[PDB]
Amino acid sequence: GMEELEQGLLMQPWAWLQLAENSLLAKVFITKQGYALLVSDLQQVWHEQVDTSVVSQRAKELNKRLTAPPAAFLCHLDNLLRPLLKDAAHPSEATFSCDCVADALILRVRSELSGLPFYWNFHCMLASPSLVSQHLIRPLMGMSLALQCQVRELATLLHMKDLEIQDYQESGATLIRDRLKTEPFEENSFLEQFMIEKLPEACSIGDGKPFVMNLQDLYMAVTTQEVQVGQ
Template identity: 55%
Template sequence: MPGAVVCFASARRRSPHRASVCIARPPLLLPSMEGSEELESSLLTQPWASVRFGESTFLAKVCFRDSGYILLISDLSSVWYESADAEAVGQRSKELNKRLTVHVSSFLNHLCNLMCPLLAGQPGATTAFSCHRSPSGLRLHVKSELSGLPFYWDFHCCPAPLEMVFRHLVRPLIQMSLALQCQVQELISLLLQKDAEIEDYRENGATLSRDRLRTEPFQEETFQQNFMAETLPRICSAGEGQAFASALQQLYTAVTQQEVKQARKPHCSEDDVDTAPTAETTKHPPSPATSQEDETTSSSERTSVVPGASPVPSIWTPSLVQELLCCKPRPSAPCWLWGLCCSPMPASMFRRSAYHPCEGIWLVYPFWV
């Protein structure tokens, strides 16, 4: 179609990550796990945190374990990551800290303790962070002390692959938007029911004891117009570093926990997928909440409690998020299109379109064929 741009993101065809990253809730020292896929699944449930280096604001999340670490950081224009095992950490520590002869696990534990307050918005007084961007990546320099001696560390981050960006940022944001929209619709329904209840009381002679408590009947259209005209501009004018306030961090965790849970369920065989009726597929697009992830399957569900992690409040429990994400699309929602040959979207276009306030969650949830 002349003048039209169609953007799709892959939700079906995926390859496993060889390295993964993420900087969120205070970094955690986790027990050793086999396979980068299981490590990334634990990273996925860590919420993003806002960090500031000089005049630049970033979103980041990190996860440490006794065999290495993985880091993901973004300025919302680019996304970078680094994954380092114990051998790489030991080699780099020898190059940067020649006077220190501690075990690799001590380096990892110290790095974890340095990143914790940074992600909590309270970097240590004796710790300095600096960030240097280049065409090939991003370097995060850390200067501190260990055992009374100077301690230096450099995170060497390279551009993150698109599939990692979609998994850790785009898909959770889309699902969070859908969950919040469903919540808003339920609240509107409750308001209308309350108005009907109040009107019934009035018709039966009930009166208010305090006139200041009187309210006008809720008008959804007026509310939406006022929100778009007044509240939305104020939200959009806030700094990008405010993208993940504490309440949204909790929702992010609940949404990603649900994705990990869904990914660990037994998958249908390829034959089952290939033999599914074409007409049925065209009419009913797969729900983002229930789509299976080829790259995140694992043999057993990890149930250990991560030390230091704050519990998710009851308002955003995984069961509630699952219920919200299973909401059926309205008939007016954009239809699901199959068979379009789409090339990968450049990062600059991706940044603009990812935050488009349309309701067409299916259109935003695309694929390449």
């Protein structure tokens, strides 16, 4: 059951999570057997994995006003984290905060369940280098390579467009330049102008929201490919 949580987690996309003070990037995978969570502030990465015993134990610690089976608690957590993952323009009514103690991060949630207050704390510890490698380094590297291939493919398409434009010009379509048209595509000058004019703003990580809003289709496609290769 624990192996399957970590498997499922690898193919989750990253969500942005508004908290009391700051924000975090978060991915979670929840079943009837437990959850696996990965959280990052773009400096450090933390991880938690729990089974149903731990769910029972901790739900009893944090919640005097109700009780329910572990799976029902796991279901509620999924209902909480799921819609807010997709966009934070969703009317939540749940609150999040976190605090740090050496190599630990505690993510605290307050929501409601059965018309009562419900509390849950995720006790996260610094992620193993293997999990950082698996969920962040390898896929981000794979993505950059794939995006570079997209770039080379679009450069190829552009040269063919220019070849077709040349074909018209050489057959008498136009004899004098009579208007501002595009210049033939040259990749070296495209690149050099990009770095000067566009790079500073284009590469801006910020609070991580650009990554979550722009690159998750590619991210999931890339982590999925490694899972399938690693078998």
